[PDB]
């Protein structure tokens, strides 16, 4: 996170740490949607160009964290994956299209002041909040500068209009992606950065007061560069797949 600020304790109780067992190391961010399912970015588990292809064995999921490197004794729950589900049509080859994956926990996690699930949007919440100008929030243990924080960082950024999104890069944008960030003009800054991947882009509904995940940190070019924007997976658009797997597989 660039130009963000330390989170408060329990500000993002659905924020998960993807942790490599060997060497020990932060793979990405992720989120808790139920006591057995975690939402991440598929490129965090599979990315052949970089020779990244993780397996269940390969990983550890850490919930309730604040501190990037201490093991938070009595606060954080560490689990194991029972299985990984990549979106069958994720496009690792051209643009990170359909960058979403699910990971079923080996055993349910007990909720706590520091551990709680986020809500997935419904068609209408999605309709009312996914708007150019509206703010959402990104969180992660990612780079601070296009280095790492000691604690979870946060930044609120406005959703930006599709055209504007599209004219900022040479990468092909699809309907499964939305970009977010301020305009050079608006001159106020912040972006997600490397190591934020897979973390949540959330909004708070003004109707029922809940927090909903609207996006997954996906990609960018640089960090906090002017006239550039972060790109996130559009979660509502991929909800049928999400739905489908949580009903067939567990």
């Amino acid at each position: 996170i660039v130009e963000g600020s330390d989170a408060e304790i329990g500000m993002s109780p659905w924020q998960v740490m993807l942790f490599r067992k060997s060497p020990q190391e932060l793979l990405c961010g992720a989120s808790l949607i139920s006591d057995r399912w975690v939402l991440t970015a598929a490129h965090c588990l599979l990315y052949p160009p970089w020779d990244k292809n993780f397996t269940e064995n390969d990983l550890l999921v850490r919930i309730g964290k604040h501190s990037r490197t201490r093991y938070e004794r009595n606060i954080e729950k560490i689990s194991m994956l029972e299985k990984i589900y990549i979106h069958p049509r994720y496009n690792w080859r051209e643009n990170l299209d359909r960058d979403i994956a699910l990971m079923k926990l080996k055993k349910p996690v007990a909720f706590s002041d520091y551990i709680h699930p986020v809500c997935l949007p419904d068609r209408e919440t999605a309709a009312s909040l996914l708007q150019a100008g509206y703010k959402g929030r990104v969180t992660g243990w990612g780079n601070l500068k296009e280095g790492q924080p000691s604690v979870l960082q946060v930044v609120n950024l406005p959703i930006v209009e599709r055209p504007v999104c599209k004219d900022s890069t040479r990468i092909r944008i699809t309907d499964n992606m939305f970009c977010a960030g301020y305009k050079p003009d608006e001159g106020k800054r912040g972006d997600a950065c490397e190591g934020d991947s897979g973390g949540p882009f959330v909004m708070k509904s003004p109707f029922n007061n809940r927090w909903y995940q609207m996006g997954i940190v996906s990609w960018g070019e640089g960090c906090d560069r002017d006239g550039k924007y972060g790109f996130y997976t559009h979660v509502f658009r991929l909800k049928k797949w999400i739905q489908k797997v949580i009903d067939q597989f567990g």
């Binding site: 304790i9 109780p13 949607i33 703010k135 959402g136 929030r137």
Partner: peptide, 27 residues
């Protein structure tokens, strides 16, 4: 379920220090 209602914030009716920035932008 009980999704997106934080045990230290919403459940206690306390606001985090930047959440109003969000809500204010929802015109």
């Amino acid at each position: 379920a009980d999704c997106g209602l934080r045990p230290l914030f919403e459940k206690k009716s306390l606001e985090d220090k930047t959440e109003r920035e969000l809500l204010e932008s929802y015109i």
